[PDB]
């Protein structure tokens, strides 16, 4: 398989191996049983990838935007979050900012959509 | 540094998860149609440079399990005969033909009056019980243990009873977290943990105090509790090397079917052929004995290297927590154990056992089973992989169990479930 | 750290010129590295940049089409393949470590190492 | 604003807030089976709208602007009075008839453009 | 034509009808909700492979992954001009699965190689 066999390198290490992980996301009370599990597996899914389409970033594994890196979510350099660290520190390092780098991603895609369209009412 | 944030899918991120997990497997009350087939080439990623915390007594694994093992059970049992038909009164007799001491008394042989394939016309019919069965009521008149209590449906005679590996595996976007640290105690950090698509077979093993056809310990004797120094909670012993158990029904029995009603009958025992002995297990004496002083070398690292250790048998209470119960061939055994439990720490065994025919399965009040007669003799020979214990200057462990939730521990100890978090960010130099 | 470079001499106008470098002494695959000019009697000059994984190569104006920059992180060397010389491209031609960056760790902009150099001579 | 907040709000004073309604329109057997058929049916919904956008050329945007010019048979009215005076309730009920009419331009016109991105990546 | 009326026509008169058909992709009662629940997850798996190749949105997806003449040595007129889609899926369905390999690595590679060009500056 692979999967999550990067969960114990280096966030620079990692990310490499996304679409290793991406793949691995996909008697009545028994159906009823596998039918929910497989209904949120989707259901989770496609929260993601409509989460991932609202900032831009359809279609992408790896997605450069246009939010500034605030020093107070994290107070690092490079170095050290892409040559020491792995995914799993970094998760528990900022996830009370979680939201806030989300809320922030979203409003960056929204000023660039209009922007495009004004750009394209030209001529 | 001018940092931006950048946006990652497919990141090897997980937190702890509680879902339903799905049942692999390669006419049985486990092996049902709803389980799938399994991976016939099993894959486990390594996970190197990772450490996990596990808590085997919060392991939302053993719950399901639990839960699924007796919903299949029942739903096993749905189709068959009920005997609700059978609870009259019973007209009984001691059998004593050929009766050694030891079953003296333990065999009836009830006549009584019961309905036929019509059901205007009654026949008068008998079938041999077991004391344990049959309850005595206002000296010849008995009843059914049942008949105050519950309905009993009757087992489905084609159905085997015999433990088939099950294998849990998880459902998308999440993943199984297997424990590969030798000499694991149940909780905490665990280094070398590695990703697995599903469980190993797991046999729905049911038994009490002795934990047959188990898994073994790689190295040392396990000794696991939720607190060790909690009395009230049990202590889960994982062998290093199976004990032997040798079970056996000797008596050559026969069956009678006996028409209820269209399309129903029930069996009954008939007479038995040649002697009639008691049913019992030899535990080898050697293995036994070296075997606890493994067990009382690991205990004492947590009691103290000059603790006396004593075992001794368990205090009274319901037949199937004071003794040894376990479905063998298909007949339910109560052994005694008090040989294996009566020693200070500082050939064979013969256990003798009794057989019941009239079942409570899981520790509830109703839903009666009963097994039918199984015909001719009787020999089982089992592992015994572990022990259940409770704490009673001298320490005494004596056997413990029921609950049915620690059998399945001692096997899903060592998995965590956990869900993907394909989703996060983090500061680059890229600039959209 | 070491850079050394080789292959170089005199070749006509119009001909062809393969340099290479040797790098030891760090880990090859990590940095980006680049060729850089000095004519005989005057400064530097940027010729061409490859990244550290060899997928990205810039190149100056004046050599855009005729010069082609090659990377071979197996056995830690840089290829530059000279097509089409002229008299304009006499120079030292150094091999240097840094340039680029690689999006992932903090950028550089600047040339971290530096061979001693081939001599072209066209 | 939250959810449907803006729906009484002029079209150009909505077309901020797509994304407040794009977030909510994915989130004892006879219960189960209910439960199921009403997020099964959520999904599916979402997919096909998903499938328009991407047939359209459109996947991946809130908004995006097509080549299909504005037919005045649809409707006769300028800029100033569908952005600035309008709903979007009173428009979707000005256009329903045209609907499917637009949808089969739109369909048309990705089909045309896509093949002349792979008639002009093949140059060379 | 509609659904499928093109399966027999040839592969460059065929991939015109692709919105066609990719519109028809999307108690006893439990039957109908797992015909309905596969097909949401085939349909899913397929979009997420055209994503990791980098086709996503599209029915029509260039890539820069060379054709090996060992899959299939012809002249492109005998492929588009006078082969059917189920033939060609036949002749090539042994190196399916090496084709879809080599798509994904080159979506990496392009992947990083996009981030490494948009912080310069
Ligand atoms: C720990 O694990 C061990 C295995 O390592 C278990 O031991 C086995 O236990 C079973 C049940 O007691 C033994 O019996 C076998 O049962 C099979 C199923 O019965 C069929 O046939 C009867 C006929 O009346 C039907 O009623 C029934 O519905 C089934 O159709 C039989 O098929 C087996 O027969 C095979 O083995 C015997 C060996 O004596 C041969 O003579 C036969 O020809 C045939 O090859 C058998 O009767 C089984 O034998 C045990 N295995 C071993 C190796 O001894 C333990 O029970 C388990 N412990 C616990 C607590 O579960
Ligand atoms: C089956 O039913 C018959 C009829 O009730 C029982 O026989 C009766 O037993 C009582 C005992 O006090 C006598 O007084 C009756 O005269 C008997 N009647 C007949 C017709 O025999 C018989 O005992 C029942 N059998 C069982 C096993 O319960
Ligand atoms: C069902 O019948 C059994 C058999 O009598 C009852 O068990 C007895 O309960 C009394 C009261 O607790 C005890 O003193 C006896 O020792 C029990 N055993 C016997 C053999 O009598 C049981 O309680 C009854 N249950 C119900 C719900 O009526
Ligand atoms: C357990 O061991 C006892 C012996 O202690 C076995 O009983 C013997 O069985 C043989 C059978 O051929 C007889 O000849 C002996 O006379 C028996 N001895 C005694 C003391 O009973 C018994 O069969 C064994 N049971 C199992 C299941 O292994
Ligand atoms: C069980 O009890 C019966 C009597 O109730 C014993 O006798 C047999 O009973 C059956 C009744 O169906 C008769 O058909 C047989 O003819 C009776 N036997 C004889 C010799 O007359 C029966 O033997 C007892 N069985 C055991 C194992 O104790
Ligand atoms: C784990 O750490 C060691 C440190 O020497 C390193 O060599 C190894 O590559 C690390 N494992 C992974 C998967 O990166
Ligand atoms: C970072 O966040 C704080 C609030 O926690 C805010 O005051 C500050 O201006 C932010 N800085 C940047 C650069 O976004
Ligand atoms: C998040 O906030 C809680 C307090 O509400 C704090 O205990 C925790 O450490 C914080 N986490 C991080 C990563 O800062
Ligand atoms: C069975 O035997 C016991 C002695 O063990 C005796 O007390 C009892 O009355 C007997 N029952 C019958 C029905 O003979
Ligand atoms: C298991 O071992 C850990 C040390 O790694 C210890 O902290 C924990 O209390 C132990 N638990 C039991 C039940 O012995
Ligand atoms: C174990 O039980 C004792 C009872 O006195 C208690 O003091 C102790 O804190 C418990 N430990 C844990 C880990 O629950
Ligand atoms: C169990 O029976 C086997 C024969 O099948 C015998 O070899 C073995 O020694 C017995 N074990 C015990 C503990 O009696
Ligand atoms: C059990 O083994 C110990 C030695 O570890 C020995 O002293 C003891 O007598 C043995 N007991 C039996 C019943 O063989
Ligand atoms: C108990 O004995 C072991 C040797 O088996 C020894 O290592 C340990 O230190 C002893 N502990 C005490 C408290 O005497
Ligand atoms: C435990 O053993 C003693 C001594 O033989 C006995 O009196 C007691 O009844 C036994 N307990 C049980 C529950 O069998
Ligand atoms: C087990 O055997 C002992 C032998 O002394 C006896 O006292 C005890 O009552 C027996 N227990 C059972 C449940 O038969
Ligand atoms: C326990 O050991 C003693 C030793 O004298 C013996 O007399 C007694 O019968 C034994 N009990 C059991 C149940 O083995
Ligand atoms: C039981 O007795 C019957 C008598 O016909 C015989 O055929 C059968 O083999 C016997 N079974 C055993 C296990 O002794
Ligand atoms: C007991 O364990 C041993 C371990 O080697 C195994 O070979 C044997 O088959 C096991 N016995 C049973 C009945 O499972
Ligand atoms: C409702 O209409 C008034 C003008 O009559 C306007 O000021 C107000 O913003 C409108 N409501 C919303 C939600 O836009
Ligand atoms: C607009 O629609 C009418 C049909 O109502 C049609 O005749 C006319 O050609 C269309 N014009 C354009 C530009 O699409
Ligand atoms: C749609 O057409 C019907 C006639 O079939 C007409 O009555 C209705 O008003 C039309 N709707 C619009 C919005 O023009
Ligand atoms: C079927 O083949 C004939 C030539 O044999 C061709 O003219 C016709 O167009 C084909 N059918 C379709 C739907 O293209
Ligand atoms: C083409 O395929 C063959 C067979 O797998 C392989 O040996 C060869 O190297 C491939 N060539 C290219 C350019 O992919
Ligand atoms: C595919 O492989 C099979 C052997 O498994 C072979 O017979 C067949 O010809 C192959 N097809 C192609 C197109 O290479």
């Known amino acids: 398989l692979g999967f999550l066999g990067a969960a114990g390198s280096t966030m620079g290490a990692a990310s490499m191996t996304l679409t290793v992980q991406a793949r691995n996301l996909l008697l009545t009370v028994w159906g009823i049983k596998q039918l929910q599990a497989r209904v949120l597996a989707v259901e989770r899914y496609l929260r993601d990838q409509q989460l991932l389409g609202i900032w831009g970033c359809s279609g992408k594994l790896i997605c450069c935007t246009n939010v500034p890196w605030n020093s107070s979510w994290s107070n690092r350099n490079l170095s050290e979050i892409w040559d020491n660290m792995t995914w799993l520190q970094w998760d528990k390092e900022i996830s009370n900012y979680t939201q806030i780098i989300y809320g922030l991603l979203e409003e960056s895609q929204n000023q660039q959509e209009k922007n495009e369209q004004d750009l394209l009412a030209l001529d | 540094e001018n940092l931006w944030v950048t946006v990652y899918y497919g990141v090897p991120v997980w937190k702890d998860a509680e879902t339903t997990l799905f049942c692999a497997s390669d006419h049985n009350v486990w092996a049902t149609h709803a389980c799938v087939p399994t991976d016939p080439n099993p894959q486990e990623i390594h996970l190197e440079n990772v450490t996990e915390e596990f808590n085997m007594w919060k392991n939302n694994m053993v719950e399901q399990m639990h839960t699924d093992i007796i919903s299949l059970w029942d739903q096993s049992l749905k189709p068959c005969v009920k005997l609700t038909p059978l609870c009259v009164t019973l007209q009984c007799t001691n059998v004593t033909n050929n009766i050694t001491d030891d079953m003296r008394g333990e065999l009836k042989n009830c006549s009584f009056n019961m309905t036929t394939e019509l059901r205007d016309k009654k026949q008068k019919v008998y079938s041999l019980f077991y004391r344990l069965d049959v309850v005595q009521i206002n000296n010849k008149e008995y009843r059914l243990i049942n008949c105050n209590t519950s309905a009993i449906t009757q087992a489905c005679p084609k159905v085997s009873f015999e433990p088939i590996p099950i294998h849990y595996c998880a459902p998308a976007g999440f993943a199984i977290l297997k424990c590969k640290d030798k000499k694991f105690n149940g909780t905490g950090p665990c280094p070398s943990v590695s990703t697995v698509q599903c469980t190993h077979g797991i046999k729905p093993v049911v038994s009490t105090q002795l934990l047959l056809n188990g898994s073994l310990a790689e190295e040392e004797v396990m000794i696991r509790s939720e607190n060790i120094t909690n009395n009230a909670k049990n202590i889960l012993v994982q062998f290093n090397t199976p004990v032997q158990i040798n079970c056996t029904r000797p008596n050559n029995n026969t069956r009678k079917s006996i028409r209820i009603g269209p399309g129903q009958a029930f069996y009954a025992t008939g007479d038995i052929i040649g002697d009639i002995r008691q049913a019992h297990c030899n535990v080898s004496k050697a293995t036994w004995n070296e075997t606890l002083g493994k067990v009382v070398k690991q205990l004492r690292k947590h009691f103290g290297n000059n603790t006396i250790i004593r075992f001794a048998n368990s205090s009274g209470g319901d037949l199937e927590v004071t003794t040894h119960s376990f479905n063998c061939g298909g007949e339910f055994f109560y052994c005694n154990t008090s040989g294996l439990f009566n020693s200070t720490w500082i050939d064979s065994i013969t256990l003798p056992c009794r057989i019941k025919q009239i079942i409570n399965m899981w520790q509830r009040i109703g839903q009666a089973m009963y097994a039918p007669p199984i015909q001719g003799v009787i020999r089982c020979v089992s592992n015994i992989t572990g022990l259940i214990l409770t704490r009673d200057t001298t320490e005494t462990f004596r056997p413990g169990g029921g609950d049915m939730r620690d059998n399945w521990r001692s096997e899903l100890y060592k998995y965590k479930v956990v869900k993907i978090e394909p989703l996060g960010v983090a500061p680059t130099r890229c600039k959209r | 750290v070491q850079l050394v470079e080789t292959g170089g001499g005199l070749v006509q106008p119009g001909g062809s010129l393969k340099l290479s470098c040797r790098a030891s002494?760090?880990?090859?695959?990590?940095?980006?590295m680049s060729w850089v000019r000095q004519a005989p009697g005057k400064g530097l000059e940027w010729v061409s940049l490859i990244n550290d994984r060899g997928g990205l190569t810039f190149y100056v104006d004046s050599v855009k089409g005729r010069f082609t920059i090659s990377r071979d992180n197996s056995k830690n060397t840089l290829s530059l393949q000279m097509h089409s010389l002229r008299d304009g491209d006499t120079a030292v031609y150094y091999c240097?470590?840094?340039?680029?960056?690689?999006?992932?760790?903090?950028?550089?902009?600047?040339?971290?190492?530096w061979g001693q150099g081939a001599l072209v001579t066209v | 604003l939250g959810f449907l907040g803006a729906a009484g709000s002029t079209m150009g004073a909505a077309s901020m807030t797509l994304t407040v309604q794009a977030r909510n329109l994915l989130s004892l057997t006879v219960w189960g089976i209910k439960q199921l058929q009403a997020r099964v049916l959520a999904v599916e919904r979402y997919l096909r709208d998903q499938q328009l956008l991407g047939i359209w050329g459109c996947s991946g945007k809130l908004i995006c602007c097509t080549n299909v010019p504005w037919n005045s048979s649809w409707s006769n009215r300028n800029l100033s009075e569908i952005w600035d005076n309008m709903t979007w309730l009173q428009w979707d009920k000005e256009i329903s008839n045209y609907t499917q009419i637009i949808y089969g331009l739109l369909e048309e016109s990705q089909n045309q453009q896509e093949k002349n991105e792979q008639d002009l990546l093949a140059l060379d | 034509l509609g659904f499928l009326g093109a399966a027999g026509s040839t592969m460059g008169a065929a991939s015109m009808t692709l919105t066609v058909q990719a519109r028809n992709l999307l108690v006893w009662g439990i039957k109908q909700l797992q015909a309905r629940v596969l097909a949401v997850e085939r349909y899913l798996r397929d979009q997420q492979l055209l994503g990791i190749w980098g086709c996503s949105g599209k029915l029509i997806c260039c890539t820069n992954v060379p054709w090996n003449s060992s899959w299939s040595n012809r002249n492109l007129s005998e492929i588009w001009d006078n082969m059917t889609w189920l033939q060609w899926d036949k002749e090539i369905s042994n190196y399916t699965q090496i084709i879809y390999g080599l798509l994904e690595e080159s979506q990496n590679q392009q992947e990083k190689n996009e981030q490494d060009l948009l912080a310069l500056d």
């Open positions: 240097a470590t840094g340039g680029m960056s690689s999006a992932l760790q903090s950028s550089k902009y600047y040339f971290d190492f």
């Open positions: 002494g760090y880990t090859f695959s990590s940095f980006a």
